[PDB]
Amino acid sequence: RFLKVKNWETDVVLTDTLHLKSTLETGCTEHICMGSIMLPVRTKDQLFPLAKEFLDQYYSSIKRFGSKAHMDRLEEVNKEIESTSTYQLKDTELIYGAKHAWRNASRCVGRIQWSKLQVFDARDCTTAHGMFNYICNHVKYATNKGNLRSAITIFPQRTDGKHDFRVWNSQLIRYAGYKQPDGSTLGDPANVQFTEICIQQGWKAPRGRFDVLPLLLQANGNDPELFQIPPELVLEVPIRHPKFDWFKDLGLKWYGLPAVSNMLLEIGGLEFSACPFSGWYMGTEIGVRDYCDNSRYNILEEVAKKMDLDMRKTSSLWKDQALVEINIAVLYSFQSDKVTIVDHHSATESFIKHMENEYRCRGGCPADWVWIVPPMSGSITPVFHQEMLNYRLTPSFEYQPDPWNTHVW
Amino acid sequence: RFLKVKNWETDVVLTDTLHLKSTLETGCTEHICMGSIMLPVRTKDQLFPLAKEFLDQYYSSIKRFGSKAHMDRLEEVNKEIESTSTYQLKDTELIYGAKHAWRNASRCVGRIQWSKLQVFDARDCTTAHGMFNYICNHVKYATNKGNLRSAITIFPQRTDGKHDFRVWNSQLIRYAGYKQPDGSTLGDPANVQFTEICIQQGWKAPRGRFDVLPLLLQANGNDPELFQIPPELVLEVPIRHPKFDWFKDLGLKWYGLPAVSNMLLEIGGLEFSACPFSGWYMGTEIGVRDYCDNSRYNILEEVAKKMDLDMRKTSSLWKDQALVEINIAVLYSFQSDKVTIVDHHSATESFIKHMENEYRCRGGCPADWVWIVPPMSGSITPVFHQEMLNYRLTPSFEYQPDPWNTHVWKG
Ligand code: HEM
Ligand code: HEM
Numbered sequence: 001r002f003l004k005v006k007n008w009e010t011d012v013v014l015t016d017t018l019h020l021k022s023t024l025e026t027g028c029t030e031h032i033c034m035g036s037i038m039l040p041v042r043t044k045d046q047l048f049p050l051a052k053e054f055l056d057q058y059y060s061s062i063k064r065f066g067s068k069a070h071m072d073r074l075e076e077v078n079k080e081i082e083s084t085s086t087y088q089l090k091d092t093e094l095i096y097g098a099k100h101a102w103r104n105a106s107r108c109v110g111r112i113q114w115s116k117l118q119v120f121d122a123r124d125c126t127t128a129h130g131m132f133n134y135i136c137n138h139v140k141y142a143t144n145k146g147n148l149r150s151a152i153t154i155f156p157q158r159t160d161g162k163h164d165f166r167v168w169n170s171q172l173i174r175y176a177g178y179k180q181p182d183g184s185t186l187g188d189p190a191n192v193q194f195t196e197i198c199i200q201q202g203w204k205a206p207r208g209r210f211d212v213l214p215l216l217l218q219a220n221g222n223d224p225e226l227f228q229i230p231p232e233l234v235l236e237v238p239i240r241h242p243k244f245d246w247f248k249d250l251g252l253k254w255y256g257l258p259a260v261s262n263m264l265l266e267i268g269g270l271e272f273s274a275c276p277f278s279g280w281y282m283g284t285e286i287g288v289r290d291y292c293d294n295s296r297y298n299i300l301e302e303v304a305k306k307m308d309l310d311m312r313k314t315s316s317l318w319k320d321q322a323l324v325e326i327n328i329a330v331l332y333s334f335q336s337d338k339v340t341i342v343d344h345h346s347a348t349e350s351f352i353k354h355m356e357n358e359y360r361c362r363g364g365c366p367a368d369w370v371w372i373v374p375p376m377s378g379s380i381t382p383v384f385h386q387e388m389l390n391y392r393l394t395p396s397f398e399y400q401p402d403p404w405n406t407h408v409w
Numbered sequence: 410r411f412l413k414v415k416n417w418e419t420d421v422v423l424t425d426t427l428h429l430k431s432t433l434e435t436g437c438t439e440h441i442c443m444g445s446i447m448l449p450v451r452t453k454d455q456l457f458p459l460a461k462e463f464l465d466q467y468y469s470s471i472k473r474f475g476s477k478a479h480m481d482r483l484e485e486v487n488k489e490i491e492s493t494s495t496y497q498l499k500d501t502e503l504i505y506g507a508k509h510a511w512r513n514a515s516r517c518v519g520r521i522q523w524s525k526l527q528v529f530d531a532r533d534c535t536t537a538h539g540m541f542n543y544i545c546n547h548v549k550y551a552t553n554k555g556n557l558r559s560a561i562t563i564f565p566q567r568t569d570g571k572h573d574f575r576v577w578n579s580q581l582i583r584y585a586g587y588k589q590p591d592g593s594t595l596g597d598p599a600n601v602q603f604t605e606i607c608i609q610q611g612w613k614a615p616r617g618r619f620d621v622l623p624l625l626l627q628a629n630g631n632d633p634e635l636f637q638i639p640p641e642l643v644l645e646v647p648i649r650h651p652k653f654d655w656f657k658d659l660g661l662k663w664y665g666l667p668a669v670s671n672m673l674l675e676i677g678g679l680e681f682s683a684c685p686f687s688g689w690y691m692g693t694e695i696g697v698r699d700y701c702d703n704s705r706y707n708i709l710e711e712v713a714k715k716m717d718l719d720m721r722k723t724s725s726l727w728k729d730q731a732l733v734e735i736n737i738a739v740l741y742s743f744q745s746d747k748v749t750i751v752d753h754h755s756a757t758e759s760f761i762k763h764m765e766n767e768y769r770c771r772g773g774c775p776a777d778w779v780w781i782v783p784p785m786s787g788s789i790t791p792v793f794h795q796e797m798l799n800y801r802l803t804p805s806f807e808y809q810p811d812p813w814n815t816h817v818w819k820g
């Protein structure tokens with residue numbers, strides 16, 4: 001009932017009760033833990049309980065739980081749902097809802113920033129060009145000439161499921177992937193397929209190693225349209241090492257804006273299938289995963305050569321040595337060009353502080369250890385020694401099927 | 410039911426049916442995952458079914474399920490239970506049992522070696538001195554002058570719970586930790602409390618930075634007794650770096666034999682409270698955890714200074730740079746002194762093949778991702794990208810409470 005989590009490096013013990021308010025399933029059972037598995041229309045009967053849950057916590061958050069205002073709103077939404085088989089959120093509810101889905105994202109280490117989120121209400125949007133306009137404005141606002149600011153743009157909610165707004169890209173800004181004859185892959189292997197769905201739709205791929213993909217926007221359920229983000233709005237960073245000059249010769253660069261566009265935001269039962277959100281990078285996401293994952297730019301071997309490491313034996317830890325350098329470069333480059341970025345040491349220390357605040361202000365903090373611990377130097381970061389409880393709270397961000405696997409053209 | 414796990418690096422998908430034989434609980438529910446939580450006498454009634462399940466597993470393994478030998482063994486065991494409230498395992502069953510507890514240890518990345526285990530049967534042991542003799546023999550055999558061999562020694566099982574055999578040390582070999590009045594710690598902070606118990610019991614502490622702790626052995630539920638492991642039997646490796654000549658000057662060394670001695674071995678319902686087992690180290694256990702944990706030796710700063718790294722800001726990744734060098738030094742040394750050791754790349758790569766083979770020949774391989782993934786360079790090892798299922802099968806190795814917290818002293 002009242003679970004406890006301990007930090008084994010500092011012996012601090014926190015008590016969690018927030019989990020009791022949890023409603024969604026985890027995938028785990030008393031017989032099997034699925035903790036490491038990546039991926040473990042509504043009715044009026046289904047919707048009202050959800051809306052009620054949401055409103056009560058919202059009114060509770062503003063110290064007006066069980067007030068005429070509260071009571072009144074419940075009734076208004078109640079009448080609206082029975083009548084309209086759905087409802088619309090008050091601006092304040094939308095903002096509160098979005099901030100909280102972030103607050104509840106158990107896989108996000110950057111949640112100490114949860115309450116500082118710019119919300120762009122794009123619910124009056126109606127077309128792909130309109131979506132394009134809102135997205136450019138979001139990108140420009142968030143980039144802020146390198147001094148990044150968190151934001152989310154929220155398009156119209158789901159209705160009959162046949163009029164869904166969707167951004168086909170996984171992130172607003174990513175590089176294209178091309179499968180050459182050499183069997184090899186040009187650019188980012190992760191995007192090969194999407195890259196082709198663009199071509200298949202018209203895009204004139206420049207076939208480069210770092211080609212900024214075009215946005216593929218879908219509005220009201222119609223077919224998706226392509227748009228090239230003003231190059232001037234996409235801040236990029238040339239990757240150079242602060243000691244190895246030959247580094248710049250690797251020809252590496254990465255974009256400054258991390259911005260997830262394929263998730264679904266759920267607030268009080270309502271579904272928002274197009275809600276791109278952005279913050280700023282933690283160094284390892286690029287240096288460790290984008291650059292060194294074997295299924296991504298997989299650059300270790302090459303960086304290894306350039307360093308003249310004894311790649312003969314794994315026990316010389318050449319892969320590890322090179323990993324560190326590649327990551328030192330990233331932070332170095334972003335910092336030099338003055339684009340906001342955080343290292344895994346600072347981000348994890350921040351998250352620990354956030355957990356403590358959350359435990360003593362909200363009764364806990366859902367967190368997914370498997371995702372929170374950085375992909376390098378795990379145990380020298382504090383989160384490694386921190387026990388965490390993972391459970392699902394709403395409002396939330398959820399994954400959803402790629403549109404190209406559901407679109408009735 | 411069937412469950413699938415996918416490797417996001419290779420797209421290889423596996424199907425698990427073995428989890429269907431999972432009995433114990435995990436700590437998780439449909440509402441909460443306790444996957445990162447460190448730690449989430451029997452009745453004839455409950456014992457009967459446990460022996461049966463075990464015996465069925467054992468006879469199936471030797472291709473004699475349902476045989477007369479199998480049926481006689483079941484009758485013999487059940488008769489013994491109703492008769493004495495317990496039962497004794499045949500040598501063969503003990504060996505099979507021990508090998509399987511290792512095979513089922515979901516937090517162990519070295520399981521590819523499971524079927525290769527020397528089992529020493531010490532169930533005829535009656536005293537602390539007897540325990541000491543058995544342990545010295547295990548240490549010498551397992552050490553094998555640096556060519557490490559996996560081994561386990563099994564002392565008498567629990568009876569009424571008032572006569573337990575227990576090895577008070579958490580590991581047969583570990584360094585003493587001492588709390589100074591100024592608040593600093595000399596030696597290994599992890600063993601301060603145990604080191605105090607040793608001193609209280611009569612140990613004469615040399616008070617150094619790497620003093621091998623004495624063994625504190627409890628036989629038949631009696632008060633524990635102290636014993637010093639013959640020095641010539643304790644293999645140690647001085648740590649030095651292949652290119653950094655000042656590394657040897659840090660004065661670091663570590664023992665070669667990792668041997669857990671505080672866990673409980675459960676086989677067919679029987680409980681073996683004293684069952685020390687040892688293998689060989691994976692580099693990071695020493696280089697990352699014992700050396701760099703803030704609560705252990707914590708040598709990152711001193712090493713970073715020497716390398717003259719920019720320690721003014723964490724974004725220089727000075728901690729990460731020093732960590733790599735320290736781990737290179739550990740591997741280099743061990744390999745130079747010809748003491749068995751495996752690096753985390755090699756070990757995780759082997760575990761993945763072991764895991765795949767297990768899914769194919771056994772229908773599964775319970776594994777705890779939180780523990781399998783190395784404490785450094787996580788994503789550049791194949792296990793990071795491997796989905797895993799964690800569940801509990803018996804036989805098994807379990808945690809038990811520290812003895813100094815439950816023991817009834819006699820005097
Ligand atoms: C301000 C800087 C931020 C930092 C440094 C940060 C950092 C991170 C990191 C390291 C991850 C893991 C990414 C991965 O492994 O794919 C992550 C995941 C995530 N973040 Fe944050 N984050 C930030 C802002 C945001 C914002 C503004 C939101 C949304 C409003 C958010 C929502 C999420 C979600 C839902 C996930 C998990 C998504 C998934 O499962 O793929 N984050 N974040
Ligand atoms: C052959 C060399 C072996 C290697 C390289 C290996 C490696 C490891 C490592 C890296 C861990 C995690 C240690 C930690 O973080 O505390 C571990 C845990 C474990 N290993 Fe192995 N192991 C080996 C042999 C064995 C043997 C022979 C047994 C038993 C017969 C065994 C039983 C276990 C158990 C029970 C755990 C988890 C203990 C706990 O939860 O504290 N291992 N092993």
Ligand SMILES: Cc1cc(N)nc(C[C@H]2CNC[C@H]2NCCNCc2ccc(Cl)cc2)c1
Pocket residue numbers: 038171258259260277278279280281282285399
């Ligand atoms: C707002 C924000 C801020 C920061 N710093 N980081 C992010 C994360 C985002 C940039 N780096 C990795 C991307 N996430 C990929 C999720 N893959 C899960 C996944 C989902 C589905 C499949 Cl099939 C595979 C994998 C978002």
Ligand SMILES: Cc1cc(N)nc(C[C@H]2CNC[C@H]2NCCNCc2ccc(Cl)cc2)c1
Pocket residue numbers: 447448519667668669686687688689690691694808
């Ligand atoms: C047979 C074998 C072979 C290898 N390679 N490694 C080991 C593991 C052993 C040497 N390095 C760390 C030690 N394990 C301590 C685990 N403590 C967890 C823990 C358990 C309980 C609490 Cl309260 C805290 C922490 C055993």
Ligand SMILES: C[C@H](O)[C@H](O)[C@H]1CNc2nc(N)[nH]c(=O)c2N1
Pocket residue numbers: 036037038370371372417793794795796797
């Ligand atoms: C199989 C395993 O769950 C998978 O590789 C996870 C591990 N932890 C992760 N953690 C983060 N932050 N991001 C990821 O993509 C992953 N991948």
Ligand SMILES: C[C@H](O)[C@H](O)[C@H]1CNc2nc(N)[nH]c(=O)c2N1
Pocket residue numbers: 008384385386387388445446447779780781
């Ligand atoms: C809180 C968290 O579960 C704890 O720090 C775990 C994480 N993973 C680990 N993994 C291994 N191999 N050994 C450990 O001691 C730990 N500690």
Ligand SMILES: [Zn+2]
Pocket residue numbers: 028029032033034035437438441442443444
């Ligand atoms: Zn779980």
